[PDB]
Design a protein around this ligand. Structure first.
Ligand SMILES: COc1ccccc1-c1ccc(C(=O)O)o1
Ligand SMILES: [Mn+2]
Ligand SMILES: [Mn+2]
Ligand code: NA
Length: 263
């Protein structure tokens, strides 16, 4: 069921979480107009293997052929790095990373805007990160995941955007995806009360248009049914006695690593 990580295991999660976050901080300077997504993946894998001495949890997972997922514009998730796909000005791109180190997983992703940004692109990404942040500020013992899911949905929909229902956040530890499921919308099936020690991810997928998605015939690429833009941000966190601790925080994040709700 819902596992409570021991202090030792939480420390291992901090290490793994930091590594995942550092892959994103490392790749930043390379996300430029003209670069291929295949190249970005090789850079990430070489870094993960040769420098972090860790391993990508995506490589081989259900047969996935690459180390990280790179999704551009209308692609919602699981975009496959390809040497023929070049980034260009105005593109919004999500790079999703999951590394395993000392037996524990670190899971995180962020949006990158390539070259000259488009206003709609920046807005979609900003609102998506904001939906993740508001959810993070709600995490603390006693709160129900349903409340967080409902809050994310209300915020996103008020902005004229939609939340993807097919995918969700998840518990994480020695396993990539563990209990509980963390839906980013209201559901009567959700009734999970948070406890200190729980580690899970929050990773809303937000579409500028309709919520419906579609899977391409390559068996991996998921796109919006209406071809509207889609954005996602993800962080791995641990519930503490008075709130939570973000384990995959980056220099560019603008929310505190440790959130407290006590007086
Ligand atoms: C290889 O990527 C996947 C394939 C099947 C099911 C889930 C995934 C996946 C990619 C990223 C994540 C996640 O962040 O949870 O999960
Ligand atoms: Mn991920
Ligand atoms: Mn995840
Ligand atoms: Na996208």
């Amino acid at each position: 069921a819902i596992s409570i990580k021991t202090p030792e295991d939480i420390e291992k999660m901090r290490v793994a979480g930091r590594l995942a976050a550092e892959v994103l901080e490392m790749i930043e300077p390379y996300v430029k107009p003209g670069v291929s997504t295949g190249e970005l993946d090789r850079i990430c894998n070489d870094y993960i293997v040769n420098e972090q001495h860790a391993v990508s949890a995506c490589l081989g997972y259900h047969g996935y052929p690459k180390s990280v997922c790179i999704s551009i514009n209308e692609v919602v998730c699981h975009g496959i790095p390809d040497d023929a796909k070049l980034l260009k000005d105005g593109d919004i791109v999500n790079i999703d990373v999951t590394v395993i180190k000392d037996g524990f997983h670190g899971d995180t992703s962020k949006m990158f805007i390539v070259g000259k940004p488009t206003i709609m692109g920046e807005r979609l990404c900003r609102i998506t990160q904001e939906s993740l942040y508001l959810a993070l500020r709600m995490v603390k013992p006693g709160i129900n995941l349903r409340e967080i899911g409902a809050a994310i949905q209300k915020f996103v929909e008020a902005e004229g955007f939609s939340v993807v229902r097919e995918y969700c956040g998840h518990g994480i530890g020695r396993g990539f995806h563990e209990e509980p499921q963390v839906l980013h919308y209201d559901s009567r099936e959700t009734n999970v009360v948070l406890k200190p020690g729980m580690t899970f991810t929050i990773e809303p997928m937000v579409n500028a248009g309709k919520k419906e998605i579609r899977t391409m015939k390559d068996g991996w690429t998921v796109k919006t049914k209406d071809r509207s833009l889609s954005a996602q941000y993800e962080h791995t966190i641990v519930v503490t006695d008075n709130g939570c601790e973000i384990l995959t925080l980056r220099k560019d994040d603008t929310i505190p690593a440790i959130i407290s709700h006590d007086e």
